[PDB]
Design a protein around this nucleic acid. Sequence first.
RNA 1: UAAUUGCGAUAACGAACGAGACCUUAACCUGCUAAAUAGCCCGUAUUGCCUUGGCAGUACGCCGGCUUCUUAGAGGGACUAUCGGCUCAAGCCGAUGGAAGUUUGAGGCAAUAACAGGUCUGUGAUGCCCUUAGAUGUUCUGGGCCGCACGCGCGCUACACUGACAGAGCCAGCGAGUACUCCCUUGGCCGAGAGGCCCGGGUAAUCUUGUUAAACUCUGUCGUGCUGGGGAUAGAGCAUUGCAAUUAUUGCUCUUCAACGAGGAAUCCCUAGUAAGCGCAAGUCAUCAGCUUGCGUUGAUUACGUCCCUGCCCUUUGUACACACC
Lengths: 60, 69, 70, 103, 142, 138, 199
Amino acid sequence: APVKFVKVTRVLGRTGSRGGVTQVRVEFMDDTTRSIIRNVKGPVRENDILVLLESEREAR
Amino acid sequence: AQHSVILDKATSDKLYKDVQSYRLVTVATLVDRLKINGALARKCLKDLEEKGLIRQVVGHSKMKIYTRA
Amino acid sequence: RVRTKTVKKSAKVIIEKYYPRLTLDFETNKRVCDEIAVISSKRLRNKIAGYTTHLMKRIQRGPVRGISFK
Amino acid sequence: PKVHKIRITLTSRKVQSLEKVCQELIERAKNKDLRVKGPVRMPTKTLKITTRKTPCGEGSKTWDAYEMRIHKRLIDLTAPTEIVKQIIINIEAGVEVEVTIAA
Amino acid sequence: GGVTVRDVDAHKFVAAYAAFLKRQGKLPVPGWVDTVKTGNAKELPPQDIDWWYIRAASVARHVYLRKTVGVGRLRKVHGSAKNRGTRPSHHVDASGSVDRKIMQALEKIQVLEKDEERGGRRITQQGQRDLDRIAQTVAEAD
Amino acid sequence: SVQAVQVFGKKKNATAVARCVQGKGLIKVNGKPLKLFAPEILRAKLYEPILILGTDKFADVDIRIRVAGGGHTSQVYAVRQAIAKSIVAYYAKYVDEHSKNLLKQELIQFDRSLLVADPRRCEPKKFGGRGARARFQK
Amino acid sequence: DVLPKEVLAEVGSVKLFNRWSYDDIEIRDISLTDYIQIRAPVYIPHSAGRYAVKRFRKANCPIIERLTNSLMMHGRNNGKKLMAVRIVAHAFEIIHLMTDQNPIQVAVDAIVNCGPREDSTRIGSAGTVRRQAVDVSPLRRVNQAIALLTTGAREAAFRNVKTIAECLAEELINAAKGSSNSYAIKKKDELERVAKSNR
RNA sequence: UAAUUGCGAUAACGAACGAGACCUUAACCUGCUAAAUAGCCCGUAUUGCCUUGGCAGUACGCCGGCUUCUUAGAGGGACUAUCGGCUCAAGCCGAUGGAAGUUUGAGGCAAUAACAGGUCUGUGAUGCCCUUAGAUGUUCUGGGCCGCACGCGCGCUACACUGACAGAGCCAGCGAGUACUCCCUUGGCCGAGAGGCCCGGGUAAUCUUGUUAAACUCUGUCGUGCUGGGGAUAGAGCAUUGCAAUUAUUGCUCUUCAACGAGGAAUCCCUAGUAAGCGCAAGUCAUCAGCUUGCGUUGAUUACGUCCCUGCCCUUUGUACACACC
């Protein structure tokens, strides 16, 4: 599978019934003109880098 | 569930066959692979050391480790 | 990590009543209060001076709603 | 007029009252041009007692700790015999004093 | 250069000195050996047969490094914990007669002397010089 | 005249008083030498300051140290911090601190705890520590 | 002669833990840099740092201390990292003697492979699973990997004549590639599989 | 924002309790006042080795010099200081400096108003009732509160190799101590062990005490076996406390060697020198700690959040209740 790498640009807010999930805005770091938002589980800072396997869920 | 406290001929010639070809030797490996007791393993350790076929890395009251010569 | 009315009202009156006599400097401010006020504790005394230095830092760039002086 | 190298000790519960007594005593002595070795201050001992508050035992279990503190601050001196009686006068109330000739 | 006792490995010194002292072969044995428990907290006699001689080095060394020493203080230095069963453990001191008589014998062979001045026993000039020699030998052998 | 400076180092309850003196390059603590005085695995962290700086900068200086109180691990940190203060203060006061300034800068950029102490103690609660007992009934 | 004569070669070399220089670390992938810190090395992990005081102060720490701390657990092993630091350094010698490669290379490449990328979080569904298969952050990756790794070693060595040093040693070398005989990788692989199901 | 702690909008303006301030304690001061019941330097005599000139120790100095370390008094020091992005502001976060940047850490006291909460077994605090000379007053002998098929709560020891066993190396803090009584006990001597005898110090930074504690570290024995992991149950013997030990007070000596392989449905405590491990002192005490109150040693994983469960308070709402859903 063609795994893509993404980078966080803006944190939005922690959703979830007990606050474990967090909304983050991420950057494709290869196509600068694109930008999307994803969810993460653990602690997250700015300028961090994430690995993304599937790029078609986009929860709420 | 017993390990022969004494060394027999069958174990002896197997010993002097492969122990020049192992990469590491330990008390555990001897009791595991060769079906020998731990007491004899320490005795065998010291005797094969002085004949000069394995080299010491570190010595300590809990674990002894040796490699080829 | 937030001040109370006692310090703020004390800060408010000192700046409004003795504006020329003090400046942005934090130690010069620290000393002037102990001469012109009657405080009974070093920590309270220090806190009043700290806010006035913060208060004066912002007045220098635009007037503030609370302050009114001659 | 043979010196004996006396030593005088004080006891009290207060601290500020005793301490000012110590300074005035050293200066009252020094005014008549006498040699003095300074104020050797002994360590302060702290003693506590803990007891239960409730008198019966129901409910949660809670303690309280009362305390009391003691100071010593003894003094020594090289002086003749009976000048001590004139000088050790004008002491406070409560403050206890013991004199040791240390002959 | 010059060395002294404080310039050698601890466990090396006791082993080195144990070998030398036994080769000399002059110290009493009151027969208490083979029947001693090493302390009220311990269970089995020590393994090494020559443990009694080895012990001699350890006690001699500290008296050199301390202002004064007595029989009772060795009890509480040598003690350890005791497994009283299912209750929690405590600290209990070693046997007194054992330490007493062993150092009685030791001082009869001109290593230390009594100190009625203040109490206890301190090492004597000849004893001090003896330990240095064995310690010095270790340095070059290293 | 005689050249000597006094510095101390502290830990939880480990006090180590030291006098750094003009000598010829020997270092030993409580009179006994440095060769042994540590648990055998931790002895590298004794060598921290001398190893990073180079022995050539310990040319002609003598040090004697006395340490008491605390525990084994507490004491070893106490004495190493005394080493740093001893060398830096003697050089500052009796030679150019320009070398000290590179020394101090380089020494604290690796680890800051060489010159500053860590304050940490305990506190008496009424629960057996910071955790209360088991609830009698709930 | 203040310093031991035998250990003298190091002085003319860059700082290292005697037997191993940290120079020339792996070049395999990305996204775990900035979170594994080796650029400032240390001899022994016994440094009394105040990493806990803030959020990411424990992110700036050499991985060597992390392993030593994680190993001590289960009551008996509370605060006794001396055995832990003993085992890790000694275990390094075993794998170095069993394989010509650098032991730091063995530890680093293993931990970068044994971390999941997606997981599942239990939001309330009234007794059922609305498990959306959420993503994972790089920092949590190493946290869970180290924790689960060390647990694999102790459980295996438990009630066995083998000891933890070589047990831990074998754990790292099996995790280098997909051996499937390692506690870490077996449980690691299922996590995405159950996560992939609820995707 | 930890807070009815503040900014603001406003028919309100200015205030009072509570919270904060306050007090005790822990961290900094080569700056002041210092100290033979605390230390260092220095000077004499002196021991051992290399010898060199030094190193490591012992005894003394009391107008030899000093107070860095130890110890207590007066003070100073942190106020969020400077910064970079949010933002009307109050603020929050992050980097630098600094001993210290969660209210710096931890405690003490603590508003209006209630409960048929607890205590008559603390009191010569107290009403009424009851008993009073065959006493429910006081006192002496023996027993019991501990008696046991069985349900429940707070704890202690273990299920081992990250261990057990044998030698050796060796580091704290908080405290306590004898007059009409018998405390803390050093040293010498006898004693396998527990214990015993004889001089002596301390009413105490002076003696016990450097409380040489435990954990811990190095070298070996044992080696997967409920085995040298485990120590319940019992037999025999020797002492100590006490007028008195049987229903064994406790200790010491030898033997005996039970269950227990990480524990179902359930459920607890806890955010950094913290949990956890390990020991020590004090309280009751002639003896008996598996108990509580305090002290120190080693020293981590995970978070900087939310209202899903379980509690609590404020607003809107309903009432035939107001002794108020008992």
